[PDB]
């Protein structure tokens, strides 16, 4: 289920964080609007790079903590507030977060593995709702 999937992802976090964020960028190419340093790069080029590997892993590290601190796939209001009030998220709308979670759930369904994709879909919905409540547009 959801907890075990946090353990699975954390067990190979660099690889999963890169693969899921490339799935997001390829599914939603307009989302490179928030990442100008990533335009005109193939996935292997993006991986080779330092900002990429570092920011992707730090994003997934914090996403797994927010997942871990959730009850029944409902994140803490404190975690949503933090995500809304991060300077690096000044540009962002809940739509950016929805897209990331759609890509995450489609990655999990396509994997050969027994991820609880319905729980991740619920978690993404619930985080978007929490982000709205914490004051993201």
Question: How many residues bind to ligand HEM according to rule CB under 6 A?
Answer: 15
User: Which helix (H) or strand (E) element contains residue 134?
Assistant: helix 117-134
Residue 62, interface with ligand HEM (CB under 6 A)? yes
Residue 59, interface with ligand DUB (CB under 6 A)? yes
C-alpha span between 68 and 54 (Å, rounded):
21
Ligand-binding annotation for 88, yes or no, is: yes
Q: Would you say 29 or 112 has its CB closer to ligand HEM?
A: 29
Q: Which residue's CB atom is positioned nearest to ligand DUB?
A: 55
For the four alpha carbons of 110, 103, 57 and 75, in that order, the dihedral sign comes to negative
**Subset of residues 73 to 92 that bind ligand HEM, contact rule: CB under 6 A:** 88-89, 92
Half-sphere exposure of 67 (CA within 13 A, CB side): 24
Q: Would you say 100 or 105 has its CB closer to ligand HEM?
A: 100
Alpha helix ranges (H) inside 12-116: 13-27, 43-48, 50-69, 77-85, 94-110
Binding residues for ligand HEM, rule: CB under 6 A, are: 31, 34, 54-55, 58-59, 62-63, 66, 88-89, 92, 96-97, 100
């Amino acid at each position: 289920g959801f907890k075990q999937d946090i353990a699975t992802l954390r067990g190979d976090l660099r690889t999963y964080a890169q693969d899921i964020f490339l799935a997001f960028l390829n599914k939603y190419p307009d989302e490179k609007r928030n990442f100008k340093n990533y335009v005109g790069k193939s996935d292997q080029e993006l991986k080779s790079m330092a900002k990429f590997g570092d920011h992707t892993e730090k994003v997934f590290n914090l996403m797994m903590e927010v997942a871990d601190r959730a009850t029944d796939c409902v994140p803490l209001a404190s975690d949503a507030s933090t995500l809304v009030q991060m300077k690096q998220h000044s540009g962002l709308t809940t739509g950016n977060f929805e897209k990331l979670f759609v890509a995450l759930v489609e990655y999990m369904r396509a994997s050969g593995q027994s991820f609880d994709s319905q729980s991740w879909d619920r978690f993404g919905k619930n985080l978007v709702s929490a982000l709205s409540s914490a004051g993201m547009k």
